[PDB]
Amino acid sequence: NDPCEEVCIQHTGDVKACEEACQ
After folding, report:
1. After which residues is the chain broken (C to N over 2.5 A)?
2. What is the DSSP letter of 1?
3. Is 13 strand, coil or helix?
4. Which residues contact 21 (CB under 8 A, 6 or more apart)?
5. Do the Cβ atoms of 2 and 23 come closer than 8 Å?
6. Contact 8, 14 (CB under 8 A)
7. Would you state the torsion angle of the CA atoms of residues 10, 4, 17, 9, taken in this order, to the nearest 10 degrees?
8. For 13, phi and psi rounded to 5 degrees?
9. Strands (DSSP E) along the chain, which ranges?
10. Where does residue 18 rank: exposed (0-12), middle (13-18), buried (19+ CB within 10 A)?
11. How would you class 16 by CB atoms within 10 Å of its CB: exposed for 0-12, middle for 13-18, buried for 19 or more?
12. Residue 10 to residues 16, 19, 20, 22: CA-CA distances in angstroms?
């Protein structure tokens, strides 16, 4: 897993959110 998407999900838990916001 990526730290970015990990930081998001770990923060807002919004997977699909960081998924696109981080690609």
Report:
1. none
2. -
3. coil
4. 8
5. no
6. yes
7. -10
8. 60, 15
9. none
10. buried
11. exposed
12. 13, 13, 16, 14
Which residue type sits at 19? E
How was this model experimentally determined? NMR
Look at the block and give the residue holding tokens 């807002």.
12
Tokens describing residue 2: 């990526």
Total residues belonging to the chain: 23
- Structure tokens, 9: 């999900």
